[PDB]
């Protein structure tokens, strides 16, 4: 989902 | 008109890599840690880690490998930068200084080729024959390793295999052989290729292709006694080697993916494995000896040792000690035990290292209601989640404050020859002296029968044989404690006044101008011993024994008056050993000799607020380090005080500084106070381990904070925090966080452990009925956190499947209340974009949290911002303004909207707004004629934005997918109806971090313009400010000169490094300056320093000073 792609991105990727 | 300045405020703290070997010497065990652009080098000792060298690279480190080439003394180091700078480095400890020499280097970028998925991999063959690089899909770059090739000319070889997952060289091969998992339809496979560097092909492999698990992702090359490879996957681990095949499917592995490994025993009989959940595993290989047929592999086995914290990086050290390099949590040293302890863990933590984690979001608060600047961050992820409070300087907590004007010196006093706790204070005034008693927390002012009160005291200590000395300017007195009487009195042969004091515990050294007299406190009498006269008037003196004697000082520190010089004398005689002329005509104010570590320090501070420092043997007297490091502008006064283990030095000035110890340097940090003039240590009956401090007109006493230049508080949350807002009138913080629950046997969700949202002092769930239409699930909450105790006052949980994305604290419309607004989103896995979310208004005012309003909304509320009395919300490609009715209702005019996806949003107090839409920065203003927003301007030129900020009305800072910063500005020129629609990149700069948050604020306040802090995935914290024509040019000047001077590790041009770089383009940097480069000017020798300077005015001093005014910026 875009949404968790975004939360992943601020963590880097994880 | 574009001038920007950028400094690091906190070096990156996340660990990206770590490796072990013998690089300091062949006879050492080192830990090498890669931060971002930083290599850290440790020695594994017995207590833990001994730092030796910390170095800057002009490049994100992406490969870090140790190896020793044929016939080589110690290990060598290979480093590959993300911008493709290669180099091989050597650790040369030649002198008492340490250097990193570039044995080779070159740029291995290829004009062709797409950066592979799974990224740069770099590897080195066991034979040290070559270096294999996998940079781009379909290509394998080989660098041959021989005594030449100091440029690392390399060659590519076509890689038939489109999509490689992982690669290592296999051990024990009669020619370099590659092993790799790759993907093609049909799943994944493992394959071999020999590397024929002779003719630059691949040949065949030493064993057939084999299928591997769909999620296979780690290749480990097992060493010679065994050979072959281990391939770690999901739910299965397997050994491969020729026709030999072994496999296990241990259920424990089946959850969390295994992310890293390390080899424990050089046999490769044992490996450590690390999870995403931070579970740590031992992987054991079972050897089956024949009786003549050598050793074979009988089986594999895994055992759960416990849990570290989430690891990027795992390194077996010595004797069951492990370093855990963490990216998402604090790093740590961890002891592995044979027997499982309490809780049933084989893992016990010895040490913990501060990581500001990924700074996910943050904000600046004047926390303890002082004009300062405290940063508070949402840091880390999952169980490593936390808040961090970053404080500048060192603070002291005020127990008592007795005001009393015009103090000119302070000495601590103890009415008992037995204890080490004092009960008397001594305040020398201009013409007088008044003594103080101490009942406990009380302070009364009677005197001692043996002490003068009509003269001024220059010293008041404790001596020998039940005695208490006063060195008044008229005469040195001696009082016995038990026998309360003047046991003798020394005066100057001609009744001349004593000028400078000096008194340890068993020794005295006064001065009457140029004249000096060394007396002694041998039982109950003041016995003169020596006399010399100085070439000039004496400014300052100090004597405190340094080790080999206790109370009896063998040496003398001295400051003179005309030749502005400091010297070392020998007290039995006074004979002049080494003297050092400083510059200027401003007198030495204080001089002091103290012991800290493996350097005996004697330093001296001048009268304009300048200082110079010197290491010295207590054996002889040689001039060591010397850099004019200024503090305040008031003549500084130096003292010694007891603290933690090591006891340190406090410099009094209008700029209160404390001198600690770094690696083996001395730390320079601000004390958070107005101005200190004099300060003494203590141990009182009513004020234990404390310090006394006097200003113009106040006496004070209290405790001292940490040690560092930045002090950091940690508030663990045990879950992911995503957003944070301060609420002044409620004295607290709102934090959005989320936690992971799992598919129950009951179906629902359980609890994988207690965290902030499950252990809050109080709670509430969403009762809203807005919707009616083996697996892992986020569960989101709103935390309410006390700004003082940082306890989790209340937690509100949102509905099943609702993710909170945005949060705000504001007043709305006419209402005086402050509501914390939360924008949500109904999130289901199958959907790409959500179609449902809400806007909830809550209230925390009394002692609890009230749900005020709910507003149904047709998508995900990605961001929101209080505009001008309304709520501007960005819902899923739409932007809508909301009104707060007087009946406490939120409402919009549904034909008044926007076609923007504002992932990031900011507002200028005006009717303005910086967004991001289809990968671009946009500028919009409110036009009430249309009840709308107008698109004033846009940055064409595409950019995968990560954060965004308004600097002023015409200039907009952005950060982006490729670790670049940029400033967009609106054109101030003609055809204002086309060229006006285009904003322009006036500034560019490769930053090397991934920015998540800018916010206006500073950590400094009690000369340049502006202050914007920023937070990083690596946990960096930066600062950005505006300059002006002169500085920017001057500093730009200073940059280019500074490049030519400074030696940079792997011979990488600062110019190349800082240049803005994306997949599409490479521009040099514009409108930016790294304070980082401009600050390394001070860390140069006066020699190279006078190089940089050749040609306003231009000088080595005029300019040294410039850079310091800049250091005070953070």
TrEMBL record, chain A:
It is found in: Host cytoplasm; Host nucleus; Host mitochondrion. A fraction may be phosphorylated in insect cells and HepG2 cells, a human hepatoblastoma cell line. Phosphorylated in vitro by host protein kinase C or mitogen-activated protein kinase. N-acetylated in insect cells. It comes from the Viruses. Belongs to the orthohepadnavirus protein X family. Multifunctional protein that plays a role in silencing host antiviral defenses and promoting viral transcription. Does not seem to be essential for HBV infection. May be directly involved in development of cirrhosis and liver cancer (hepatocellular carcinoma). Most of cytosolic activities involve modulation of cytosolic calcium. The effect on apoptosis is controversial depending on the cell types in which the studies have been conducted. May induce apoptosis by localizing in mitochondria and causing loss of mitochondrial membrane potential. May form homodimer. May interact with host CEBPA, CFLAR, CREB1, DDB1, E4F1, HBXIP, HSPD1/HSP60, NFKBIA, POLR2E and SMAD4. Interacts with host SMC5-SMC6 complex and induces its degradation. This is Protein X. It comes from Woodchuck hepatitis virus. The chain holds residues 86 to 99 of 141 of the full protein.
